[PDB]
């Protein structure tokens, strides 16, 4: 590739529809979401992508049935643990002042180098856009302070956002970082991840006309 | 005009593609914007006809003002004309953007409080200006409600810093044709996409 995004955001959606289409229960797709994340990680390391942010689950996601919440929470926990067994600088962002936040992930709420490091991997866990923006409007000297102090301030601008499951929407992922993100939608559900999904998203990105500005 | 089961309460419009449209016709980059005015009129007419409650037009942003002077005059004049032409019609008009600047057209200052379908224009708007303006109720764009469907002409799939608060859950529909090549079926196809969610 001629041009590569510095930072890729991943919305690994489609897990419940994927399960249903296979004659499984809605809650049973999320565990088939783990290996795909691993492949996105391996391809990203291989091409030398600097940063990937995975949309794990939101505060909004937690109003779902308990059976689904346990399943997507456990799949998020396992994904982080599995990337932690690899070569990554891991960070987890989300509301830690809540029962819903998995204790297992508290040790990743400050960027943690694992193995040989290099690539930055972020997870949004018990994340919410409103929580993110208001975090700053606690006790900030000024407006110029607020944006530097959003809960996600450590996560830089997203160049390319890739969403599985055929919906073209952000679902409140990082409103500040996504203002100029090029958005690529994969029609396949996340558990049907294929490398060509990512290769096609990267071609889309490199095909953008850079004369056109923001 | 087809009939629809579901309709968005609020549609955002990013009328992009004006410069590429001009270039493909052998015109100068700045010379497409004026061909953007009638399309806005047609989106307004179709929206009134189906009884869409609110439409927000992306006019121009603080970022857009770092483009050449020849382009800035041309998009600023086309925005001014578009507001004036919707004002000649049956509409509750609001203009949001940074009025504390030379760049903000004096002609539009009278529309920076709602008059009397609701039609909003972003004029010298900036996402950073918007948020740094309790907080969430007091963003510069607080009057503009959540966007249900955002339609962008000119083939790019991105928000270009349009209303980060209101667009968090917006379904986004991209028309490949440039804005001056607007066709009614662009909007109809966007509305079918919306109802099929
Ligand atoms: C106000 C609606 C019709 C106006 C007619 C055309 C002039 C408006 C300017 C077009 C550019 C707006 C979108 C640019 C998006 C971007 O910055 O990438
Ligand atoms: C990652 C999340 C939150 C799911 C994305 O879909 P939405 O969040 O837009 O889904 P609904 O609001 O329609 O449930």
Residue numbers in the entry:
A (entry chain A): 6 to 219
B (entry chain B): 3 to 118, 124 to 140, 150 to 213
Paper passage:
The crystals of substrate-free MM_0014 were soaked with either IPP or DMAPP to obtain its substrate-complex structures. When soaked with IPP overnight, an electron density consistent with an IPP molecule was observed in subunit A, but not in subunit B where fatty acid was still bound. IPP was bound to the cavity opening of subunit A, which remained in an open conformation and bound an inorganic phosphate molecule. Superposition of the two subunits of the IPP-binding structure (designated as “free+IPP”) showed that a fatty acid ligand overlapped IPP and therefore might inhibit the binding of the substrate to subunit B. It is also curious that no electron density derived from a Mg2+ ion was observed even though the crystallization buffer contained Mg2+. Superposition of the structures showed that the C4 of IPP, which is the atom involved in the C-C bond formation in the head-to-tail condensation, nearly overlaps the C2 of DMAPP. In fact, the position of IPP seems unsuitable for the reaction. Because of the absence of a Mg2+ ion, the pyrophosphate group of IPP is misaligned by ∼3 Å from that of DMAPP. If an allylic substrate binds to the donor-binding site, IPP is considered to move deeper into the cavity because its pyrophosphate group would be coordinated to Mg2+ along with the allylic substrate.
